[PDB]
Amino acid sequence: DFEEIPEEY
Amino acid sequence: ADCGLRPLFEKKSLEDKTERELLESY
Amino acid sequence: IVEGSDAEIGMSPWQVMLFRKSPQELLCGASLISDRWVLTAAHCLLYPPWDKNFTENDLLVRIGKHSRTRYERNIEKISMLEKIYIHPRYNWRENLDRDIALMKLKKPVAFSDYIHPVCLPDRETAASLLQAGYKGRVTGWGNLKETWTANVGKGQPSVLQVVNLPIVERPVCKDSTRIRITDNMFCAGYKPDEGKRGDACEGDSGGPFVMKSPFNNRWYQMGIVSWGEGCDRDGKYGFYTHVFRLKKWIQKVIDQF
Numbered sequence A: 001d002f003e004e005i006p007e008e009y
Numbered sequence B: 001a002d003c004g005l006r007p008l009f010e011k012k013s014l015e016d017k018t019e020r021e022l023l024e025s026y
Numbered sequence C: 001i002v003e004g005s006d007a008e009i010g011m012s013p014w015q016v017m018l019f020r021k022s023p024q025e026l027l028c029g030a031s032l033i034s035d036r037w038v039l040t041a042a043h044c045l046l047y048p049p050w051d052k053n054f055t056e057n058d059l060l061v062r063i064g065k066h067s068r069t070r071y072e073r074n075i076e077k078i079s080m081l082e083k084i085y086i087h088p089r090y091n092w093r094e095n096l097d098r099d100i101a102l103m104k105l106k107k108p109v110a111f112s113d114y115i116h117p118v119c120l121p122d123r124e125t126a127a128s129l130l131q132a133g134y135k136g137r138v139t140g141w142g143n144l145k146e147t148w149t150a151n152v153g154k155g156q157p158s159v160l161q162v163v164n165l166p167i168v169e170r171p172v173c174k175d176s177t178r179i180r181i182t183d184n185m186f187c188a189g190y191k192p193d194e195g196k197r198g199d200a201c202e203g204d205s206g207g208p209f210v211m212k213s214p215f216n217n218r219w220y221q222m223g224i225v226s227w228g229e230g231c232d233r234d235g236k237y238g239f240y241t242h243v244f245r246l247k248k249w250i251q252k253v254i255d256q257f
């Protein structure tokens, strides 16, 4: 249950 | 900065909640 | 970790998290030694018996974190790896000897109050500090209890956990296990009748084992989380990779790549 990593990364 | 010197503690002259447990063990 | 305590903000500015891209999960812990270099355990990236093998872009490096799970924007920094360097004599086959890897970040992380490197030891420091009885500190985001079966214990923590462990004498360490110890790994933990306790556990592999130089106030990474039998078990100790013993190799990679 990890927060969504900023898709640019 | 140079390794091992923490900005929020050492560079501020503040010790953490248990570093004293370490230095004390020596 | 195990029998640990919530870390304070910026208490371990070198702590690094190893994060898997897909699925997104915590793989191991690591450490920042410079602006483009991170130190971890080799078995964190390679372990043939469990078909574990991650290439450069199978993972990310999250620096400056405190919360295990959240995305701390404006604090943490996520890097991408240019190259992974595993010790060429690393023994995954029998005892995890020389359990150490190095990772080259595509771009140098910037330093802040939450991101700062740790020091590597030198002869005089390794010599003076790595004496049994001396206490070092190990940090991580791993399980708060043994995994072994279906058991209770506050799963994983929401925040990074710190536990100050004492260094154990060699004859003791080697008598505690059937694995073949090697001068490239030390063991730390409290003995049965000492009363106190604590141990790294699953999810902390690769994590720093640091010490504070009373001769100059600098923190030095004496070890890296490698292996253990259970977690916080009586008569058992956690084994850590001997950085100093491997400092010559660490230097070759960095002074070439």
Ligand SMILES: N=C(N)N1CCC[C@H](C(=O)NC[C@@H]2CCCN2C(=O)[C@H](CO)NS(=O)(=O)c2ccc3ccccc3c2)C1
Pocket (backbone or CB within 6 Å): C043, C092, C094, C095, C096, C179, C199, C200, C201, C202, C203, C204, C205, C225, C226, C227, C228, C229, C230, C231, C232, C238
């Ligand atoms: N259990 C604890 N407290 N851990 C914390 C410290 C890091 C440990 C780690 O997993 N390391 C990866 C290695 C390689 C694969 C298995 N393993 C282990 O340390 C497991 C972890 O539960 N232990 S073991 O008892 O079965 C064990 C002990 C020593 C080992 C040495 C070489 C190869 C496999 C080993 C396996 C896990």
